[PDB]
Amino acid sequence: MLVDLNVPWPQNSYADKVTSQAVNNLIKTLSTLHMLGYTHIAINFTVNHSEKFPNDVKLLNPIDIKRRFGELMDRTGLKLYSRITLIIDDPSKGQSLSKISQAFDIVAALPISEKGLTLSTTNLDIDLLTFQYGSRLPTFLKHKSICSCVNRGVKLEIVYGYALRDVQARRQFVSNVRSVIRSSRSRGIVIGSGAMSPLECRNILGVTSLIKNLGLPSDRCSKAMGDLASLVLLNGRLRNKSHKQTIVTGGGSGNGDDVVNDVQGIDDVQTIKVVKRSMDAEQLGHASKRHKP
Amino acid sequence: KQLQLAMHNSKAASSTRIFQALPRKLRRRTASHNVRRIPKRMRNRALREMRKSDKAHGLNAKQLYKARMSIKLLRLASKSTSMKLSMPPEVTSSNCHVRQKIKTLKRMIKESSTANPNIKLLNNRMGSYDCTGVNE
Amino acid sequence: KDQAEKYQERSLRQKYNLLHVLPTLNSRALSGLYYKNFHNSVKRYQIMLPEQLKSGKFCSHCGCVYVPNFNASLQLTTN
Amino acid sequence: SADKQLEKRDYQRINKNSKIALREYINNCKKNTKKCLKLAYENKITDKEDLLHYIEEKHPTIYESLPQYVDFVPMYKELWINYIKELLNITKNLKTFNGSLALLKLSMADYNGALLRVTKSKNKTLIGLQGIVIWDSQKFFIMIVKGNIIDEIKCIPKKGTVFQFEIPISDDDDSALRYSILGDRFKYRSVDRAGRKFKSRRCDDMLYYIQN
RNA sequence: AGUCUCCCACCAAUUCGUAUGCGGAAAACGUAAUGAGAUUUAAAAAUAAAUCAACUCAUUAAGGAGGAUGCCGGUAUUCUGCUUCUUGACCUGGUACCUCUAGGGUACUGGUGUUCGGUACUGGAUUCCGAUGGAAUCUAAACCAUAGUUAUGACGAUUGCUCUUUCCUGGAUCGAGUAACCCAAUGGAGCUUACUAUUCUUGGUCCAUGGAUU
């Protein structure tokens, strides 16, 4: 496939509401990304761990994909997922990842301290680990504590939206990216695009050009926003649709029928799938020995 | 433990001398700190030997080897420290003094086969002699 | 999640199921598998052995060295 | 003074006889089917009815050693769907349903009376098989399969395979619920109430599930 | 590569004097045969748990002779004898003895009453004594690798190998790859882990599944 894992939802925190112009800009850039050839699109959210989440569990995500972007999915046939990223600065601050991981589909944490880096690599349920590439990374990246979290269900993300914004941030971007590929041995990495407008978007032939210049080869950079991000989506989606990756609430055969490929068919409010009873006990047990589909 | 004696000793040298690290052909690495471990086949035989309870009166055909090796097993498992068999087997909780000293060593081996000829012991207390074959 | 003692109904229902499979289609010498599953599921519950001194102790069960749940009228696999 | 803590010397013997009877039963059924099918090539009997008479009248001794799929149907499957149907409190009006809780119960349930079908796998010579399980081992599913003229006993591996099963709901337009079980993370399940060293693992070997 | 074992001074005997299925100086070492078990157990988590494989455990001295099962005096198999030998547990009570200085040591004989032993050597230079011996002074070393100290670089020209476009360990053509896991720090023998997803390669097995044979 072709997948983009980051499109910033315009909002500071749970404090202020969103103006309509930002939403129209989001629609325009979403249509542009579709025009470039992207099938599955994420939508990020940036909150800090040191702030209260609302008590009422229903309002833990205001994206509301099913009824904000219905017509765009009708025409373009796009698939939209929600996502959350949490700022981690100091542990022993409460607000565990129990309920916030319930409403969302992907949970990620970016650390900005030594304690944050220690906490967010061995003893968390996250699936994406990201840094802030427009500043100074908190620690020299140890060669052992990063390669020993890839073997769990965690991956690293590179956002190139910082390489097209200003002049001073480019140096930090280059240095931090070189450090990350050097320390992580370049095994599990995915690429997003924090574009704030249609001008900043790039296609598959114009995202590999930048990254190939910072050390990463071409085939790996193609696999970056390929099946790897699909596996990230799979881990994100197998957390509220199954117990321990053993009993999913999914559907049957036929192309585009999975737990990630099917978004409209599954009633997420009740997590059930009512389907036509077309397969019974008194029918021949083979593919072609029975002919009726 | 007073450094005054250390200063007095170094008075037979310079003020602050410097010593080199060892040449690399004279270095060794530290082994383990716990006592050695016995093979299991030497443990089972000794355990079953001590747990056992106690027609010219010799009657020892092929049993001489059994006795002469049970003696060694008893001595080993009564002497070595690495022998950690179980809680009951001890030197006195089981008859080790009585066995192989007034039961096996003399009553059994000595009274079956008389010592063979050539009792010429040696002229040494270390086995040392000649092994030459004239014309063979 | 499971409540404090709402799980009792589930435990008794699963017990009922693994008990019912023995008096159904018991003409096959392979009911031993289901017997073994039942006993593994009855120890795993740490429950006191089910109403013993009545059945399951060398009578009305395990007619030979297998468990065919031997029927009334002295029916047996006779191996 | 009535536990008889040493009655457990038959459980060992029962467990030893079970695993030697099952192998012979499976081999007997497989050999019987393989021998019986080769008689239809020299003759013209192609239907599930007349073959029964022909075998029971020309080779009658081995007739009583065939699966007869229908014998497993009448209440061993169709009358044990009610088991799960009552284990989850499933009725006509399902607005009182609780997802992620039925997902908990089904993870600790018994899958001997049930109907299974393969949807996706890493072996594309196995798609579409539908059967009734009899014994679910640790490394296999063993099930009975209805053929065109003769039944078979099929053992299919769990590693690299996805199954589904349906559950009838009520008498309203004959709808149902649909669930799917994976095959690579099934041995690490809790059989009953336990909780068992649930570690964390990668997912790079579960690619075929979303490959298309 | 590692939170792991063993060796890199000697012992005729307070030092593993340990003939123990076979190999080995030794090993948290290898391998053969028979047989049996898995929280109901010698034991693992609440390796295996239809068969074969895998995990763990129990038993089994070499040589040579004799008789027989099988096949042409023989070999594989099976039961019965023989030979291999340094007065050796620790503690302790008695008698006799000793070239040992009232105490020590040695012979014969009674009593169930987790690391600890001895012996030993620095490199180099100068000097002194009627000597294959003895004595004194000064100075720092013992620094040593067909990768050797956190170096193993920047590029070109041919030939192999795998796949493949057209052909005639077969030959000529068209076009792509030569990877992944990773890196010495005093050396060696072991073991334990990580890898090769039409993304470098080679060989097998399946009482696994689908088709053709028949």
Residue numbers in the entry:
A (entry chain J): 1 to 293
B (entry chain B): 71 to 124, 138 to 219
C (entry chain K): 3 to 81
D (entry chain D): 68 to 279
Quote the study that presented this structure, word for word:
Ribonuclease (RNase) MRP, a site-specific endoribonuclease, is a ribonucleoprotein complex (RNP) comprising a catalytic RNA moiety and multiple (ten in Saccharomyces cerevisiae) protein components. Known RNase MRP functions include its participation in the maturation of rRNA and in the metabolism of specific mRNAs involved in the regulation of the cell cycle. RNase MRP appears to have split from the RNase P lineage early in the evolution of eukaryotes, acquiring distinct substrate specificity and cellular functions. S. cerevisiae RNase MRP and RNase P share eight proteins (Pop1, Pop3, Pop4, Pop5, Pop6, Pop7, Pop8, and Rpp1 (two copies)); RNase MRP protein Snm1 has a homolog in RNase P (Rpr2), while Rmp1 is found only in RNase MRP.
The resultant map had an overall resolution of 3.0 Å, with the central regions as good as 2.5 Å. The final model included all known components of RNase MRP, except for a peripheral protein Pop3. The proteins are forming a clamp-like structure embedding RNA and protecting most of it from the solvent, consistent with prior biochemical data. RNase MRP RNA forms an essentially single-layered structure dominated by coaxially stacked helical regions. The fold of the C-domain of RNase MRP RNA is remarkably similar to the structurally conserved fold of the C-domains found in RNases P from all domains of life, including yeast RNase P. Pop1, the largest protein component of RNase MRP, forms the main structural brace in the RNP. At the same time, the N-terminal part of Pop1 engages mostly the S-domain RNA, which is different in RNase MRP and RNase P. The N-terminal part of Pop1 undergoes RNA-driven structural remodeling and adopts distinct conformations in the two RNPs. Interactions of Rmp1 with the foundation of the P15 stem result in a ~45° change in the stem’s orientation compared to that in RNase P. Rmp1 binds in the vicinity of the catalytic center of the enzyme and is involved in the formation of the substrate binding pocket of RNase MRP (below).
